[PDB]
Amino acid sequence: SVFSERTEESSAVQYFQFYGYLSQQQNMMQDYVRTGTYQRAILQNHTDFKDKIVLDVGCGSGILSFFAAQAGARKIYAVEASTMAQHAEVLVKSNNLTDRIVVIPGKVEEVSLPEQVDIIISEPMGYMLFNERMLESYLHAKKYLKPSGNMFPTIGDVHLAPFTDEQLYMEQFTKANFWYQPSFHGVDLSALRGAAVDEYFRQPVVDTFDIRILMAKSVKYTVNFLEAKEGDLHRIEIPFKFHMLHSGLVHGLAFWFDVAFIGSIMTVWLSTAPTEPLTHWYQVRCLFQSPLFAKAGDTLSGTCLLIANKRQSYDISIVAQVDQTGSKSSNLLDLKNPFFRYT
Amino acid sequence: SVFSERTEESSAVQYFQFYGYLSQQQNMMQDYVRTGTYQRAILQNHTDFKDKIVLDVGCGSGILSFFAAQAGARKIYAVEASTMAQHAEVLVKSNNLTDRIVVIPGKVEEVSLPEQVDIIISEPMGYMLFNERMLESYLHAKKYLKPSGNMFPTIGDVHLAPFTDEQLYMEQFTKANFWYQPSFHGVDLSALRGAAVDEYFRQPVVDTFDIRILMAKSVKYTVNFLEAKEGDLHRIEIPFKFHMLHSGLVHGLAFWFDVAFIGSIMTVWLSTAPTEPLTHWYQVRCLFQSPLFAKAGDTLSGTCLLIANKRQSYDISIVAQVDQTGSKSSNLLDLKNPFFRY
Amino acid sequence: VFSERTEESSAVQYFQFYGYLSQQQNMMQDYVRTGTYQRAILQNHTDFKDKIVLDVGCGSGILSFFAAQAGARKIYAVEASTMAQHAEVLVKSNNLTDRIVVIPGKVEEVSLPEQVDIIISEPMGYMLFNERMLESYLHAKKYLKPSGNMFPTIGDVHLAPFTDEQLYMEQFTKANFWYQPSFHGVDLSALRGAAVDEYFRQPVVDTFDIRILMAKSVKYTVNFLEAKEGDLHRIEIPFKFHMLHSGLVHGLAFWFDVAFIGSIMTVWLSTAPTEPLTHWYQVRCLFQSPLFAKAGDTLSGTCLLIANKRQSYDISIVAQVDQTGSKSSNLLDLKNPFFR
Amino acid sequence: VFSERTEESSAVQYFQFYGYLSQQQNMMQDYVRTGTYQRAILQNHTDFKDKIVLDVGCGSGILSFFAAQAGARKIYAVEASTMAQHAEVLVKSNNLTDRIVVIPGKVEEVSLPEQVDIIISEPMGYMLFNERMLESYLHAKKYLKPSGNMFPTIGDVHLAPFTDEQLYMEQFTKANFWYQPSFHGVDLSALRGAAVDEYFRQPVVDTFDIRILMAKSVKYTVNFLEAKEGDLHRIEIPFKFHMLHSGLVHGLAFWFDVAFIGSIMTVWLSTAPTEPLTHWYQVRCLFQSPLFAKAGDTLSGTCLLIANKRQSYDISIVAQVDQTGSKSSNLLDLKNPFFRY
Ligand SMILES: NCCCSC[C@H]1O[C@@H](n2cnc3c(N)ncnc32)[C@H](O)[C@@H]1O
Ligand SMILES: NCCCSC[C@H]1O[C@@H](n2cnc3c(N)ncnc32)[C@H](O)[C@@H]1O
Ligand SMILES: NCCCSC[C@H]1O[C@@H](n2cnc3c(N)ncnc32)[C@H](O)[C@@H]1O
Ligand SMILES: NCCCSC[C@H]1O[C@@H](n2cnc3c(N)ncnc32)[C@H](O)[C@@H]1O
């Protein structure tokens, strides 16, 4: 299948085991911004669901499918590849919706549906949107979508902005400098200090922050889920050009994302921006190996290149320069192993 | 190999990727109780190492191999399966010990050593001692040990005692109450209420506690690494009989372990007991799904059974019974995925 | 009448309870109750001076004495319990035999010599409606002249959603006893559900800090001057709260105010948590499962009171968060409350 | 039968009270009760091995399960309240439907179809006799085979004179609320006497230090194997205390024991103040007037318990100092005890 060809089995096993836990479903369902906005988006656009045929990709506990039922859907095909599919069936039975909701255990790339659907629903967004690469399953499912069909969410926006955070940057060296000592119980560790620094800088930092650390207006990269193909996400190039609001040192790029549910009645936004209430996605920061100095008005230009890997994630390559000085910097990060720094 | 048969590849990949990170090594090294005690055990028993052949199973950054070098060992074969082997070699070079420490990348079950060894060193202890199932790799390595040889650590003591902690119990039972909701956004979740409770109570709790929650003297189970076979650890059965000292509710069993480095000069103990300084192993508590009552003087008997699984961990089944009243409690736990409460 | 709306068993224990002097002392030591009652009557002594009074449930007779102090020419004090004997004793020792006339028996049965200008009583129980004495209080209007008055004149019931994690776990903990799979070797888990219901059928009587209230209270008024006896067999109270803070709603809090709409001034007797504590305290009904609501949401539903023959009420509460559809329903027995 | 000696009003409230699971819970949490009962049965398994058992007032059915553990063949479990319903469930879930047979109704009204080898029950109330369930227990002996046994087998009530100046003063401090001339302009004085009498008619349910007891206890035994239910309608307990310490006696302290005389051993369930506290506590009845006694004097008199239609007893106590001739008495309503703990 398409899934098995882009995923190393070792990764797939752990991925679906992780989602078999009810504790994980609970944690996600307890994010009201997530749960609430989806319900609102579906219910306030009931004309997109009323007596329609619905596909739920990675339904988990099946919460989204129930929302589709509340909106008046005729039939909902809820697909789940983990063992959470068992528990989903239980809830459909106990909620007496066995006649409208059909739980299909398996991967959406492998199962077969009896008919085309009017709309696909899913919550495939990971850290800075693309983590988990589930967006590709979401786009793959479009093979079951009528040419008239819609998708919730309809679009995805990733936001990039440069930040200054001296404490975050110094932290990496404070920790790595553990290795910079000549006699740890008689052992000179200093030779591994360089390797420790690199390791720490390869980790995207997941937490939140005061919006005042952002030094320029954000750049936006949009994915239209109605137009995009699976292969469009294997390699995501995000050029950027930041016009600096304040003079100072830039220690890296901060990331967040929005998704919009563009229904017939109204558009509903789900935002994980630092200006909005915190969500379980938090925000993501990628440090530069060397800070770049830029005075206000200067231009910080470069490329953020996301390369998909077999571990259901992305290799992040960032290159940036100050146009006026030629001062340059880069970094390579592994989005699969982020550092969770939130209190 | 022996390793690949007992281990799901998925678990192995994740396992050795975890230990490939320097940050993990730093964390273990900063446990000064661990590092200081290991160094003490080796150096104060330096006669066991001087001019001897040493095998370091899972050397990681190679710290123990450096201790064995400090003690006068002539040759140290340091086996490491993760990519940390490359970092070890770097440290060996930069510490000018190339003539004495030989890094051998690979699994101990798969590599071939040039000669038999006088002593095997390693730190195969995980949560509850047995997690990670690395004691088996430790024992497997005995195929390279001379008959006169020794092993550091030499033995492992598992301690278990009944505890009372209403707060912890409510805490875990409370998280399962989420799945009692009859209308979460209009959806009835209560059908999954039972499975939720099971899932949360299958989690061993890793943290520390005041020793006054323990309601009886600990029971001890000893594993002799010199005499034990690999297969002996596939199924570990620990019967217990506690004589209750105080009256009240027993919410579960508390676990910790000691290991002894039985050297020629001196025996050195590394203890993770709640009476001892805290280590990165902490202690482990398995909760009963329902607490049992017992008066002081009563007898609490049962068995703790550890079933090895292919995810490099154990399936824990605990049956407890108040002999005087017949009050019974049974619970299963997945040692692989515990709840870190600290 | 009273006999048909009341099981004999309940009536016996009921009037036996009010035959004890220790209970009268307990009620009289409530200086909020006694003081406010005395003020309401004396401040509006024009409604009593040289008037005909009916004391429905005089007990020790304290209210009738207040009516006497106000200047009432004749006071008919009706009491069903044996406390009627004690009242007569006090009437004689206070030299008021020409003013206060004790009449043993139930108000629904006794015959009075003349119509009265005003009826006085204190029929308010927990949540105001407990004891179902308001009905007897209304029934007594048959002796009330047109243009007459009633003390209390009206009754306000207040409802508000609260948050109290501790209280919720307290009642859940008690129900967790029947989860034991081997209590002395016996499996009790089969009755876990029945236990949960039972404990959550109990209204909680106690006081609390007003900061637990997550919205402004709803008001439900019962005008005793216009209310018919039949109106209190079934009482439906619609409520629509606008949540002020975000968090878990563990239930609804209950208290009541009664007003003495007198000639000179209206006097209020409040059991609100903002007001000094009374022997009525407040009453809280717990949801079997709390509902989550964010500030700005609306909590809608209906509190339904259905009178039973045990001189109490069967309280059905249904509540929902209109924005999310989060719903909760619980039935409570007002007869057996839990005092903590 | 039950209907003849019980007012309907009392019967309603009595069985409603026991229809609550919260009530069964509180009793099962008394380890002394549950423990001793389980201890008594299992340690005398010879009296239960493959036998037929009758459980009078099984409640939640806890006792029936204990008999089952001992290897009983059949157990007839009778329950008049709605708790019988929940008992049905626990029998089903514990897979003992083929051994335990629940019967809804009064033991003196239900129709039993077989004779039994032993009768089990918990009839003890405050002062043992309260609730008068001890008569249903004896009534059930009509289903008992001769030579059969009973658990409990005997019941002991213990009487001792106590001195408690604080407890005696409390009654007046409370009643003296009425002794004021202007409570909000009202003279309550005339009811003070009535208030005093009312308080003194209430037996006090709580615990106390053994040091207040001024003489070794007297004991009155009820042999449940050798007694008819009529024997309990009127219980006369003559007493004669030889005073240890010199002082004032404010009343009599009550507590009880029951024994399970099995083939293997006898097991005692004690509610004495010397033993760990139970949900029965102890009971004290005040004299209207304290009696002064010298160390050596003898406090004689009788404690007369008269069964009433309210499933309880009217308590008449008369006592005198023989050396002085000073006498005091009191009359108490055991249905309305004052819980002071
Ligand atoms: N809030 C961020 C987390 C979103 S919940 C992701 C859900 O989609 C399922 N899932 C993932 N890939 C899938 C696939 N190819 N087919 C079916 N289900 C899949 C996965 O098992 C989980 O239940
Ligand atoms: N708290 C105690 C932590 C234990 S450190 C475990 C160390 O031994 C390595 N290791 C594990 N199993 C191994 C095997 N079979 N062969 C070689 N190296 C192995 C693993 O990669 C890591 O470096
Ligand atoms: N704080 C709570 C207020 C209780 S004081 C109400 C008094 O009125 C009596 N009473 C009750 N129902 C009655 C009736 N139908 N007729 C006459 N007296 C009655 C009752 O016995 C008591 O003495
Ligand atoms: N401290 C120990 C308290 C004793 S528990 C009293 C139990 O005996 C039942 N019971 C009482 N009288 C009964 C009768 N005549 N018939 C059947 N069940 C009866 C009553 O319903 C309750 O379950």
Side-chain angles (χ1 to χ4, degrees), chain D residues 17 24 33 36 61 66 70 85 141 153-155 179 199 203 215 223 228 248 283 294 297-298 308 319 321 334 341:
Chain D
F17 175 88
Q24 297 296 331
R33 172 187 173 275
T36 307
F66 290 166
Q85 302 170 351
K141 280 198 295 188
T153 316
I154 65 166
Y179 201 65
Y199 284 120
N223 191 316
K228 292 165 59 180
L248 296 172
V283 189
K294 311 165 187 172
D297 290 339
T298 58
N308 59 39
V321 183
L334 183 55
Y341 54 72

Side-chain angles (χ1 to χ4, degrees), chain D residues 280-291:
Chain D
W280 285 285
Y281 304 84
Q282 293 83 41
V283 189
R284 280 183 287 175
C285 303
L286 292 165
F287 291 142
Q288 294 180 9
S289 306
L291 300 170

Side-chain angles (χ1 to χ4, degrees), chain A residues 3 6 15-20 24-25 28 34 56-61 79-85 104-111 122-127 131-138 257 280-281 312:
Chain A
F3 181 88
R6 65 166 173 83
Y15 181 85
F16 292 115
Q17 281 185 356
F18 173 83
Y19 279 114
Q24 187 56 222
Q25 291 295 324
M28 282 169 187
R34 172 197 192 267
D56 190 347
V57 185
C59 64
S61 60
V79 182
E80 178 60 44
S82 71
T83 58
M84 186 59 60
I104 299 171
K107 301 163 190 178
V108 66
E109 293 80 354
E110 302 177 357
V111 303
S122 183
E123 46 213 334
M125 304 91 79
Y127 288 134
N131 194 44
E132 305 186 26
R133 292 186 61 177
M134 188 183 174
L135 280 170
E136 293 169 49
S137 301
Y138 188 43
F257 68 87
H280 70 284
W281 286 285
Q312 294 178 273

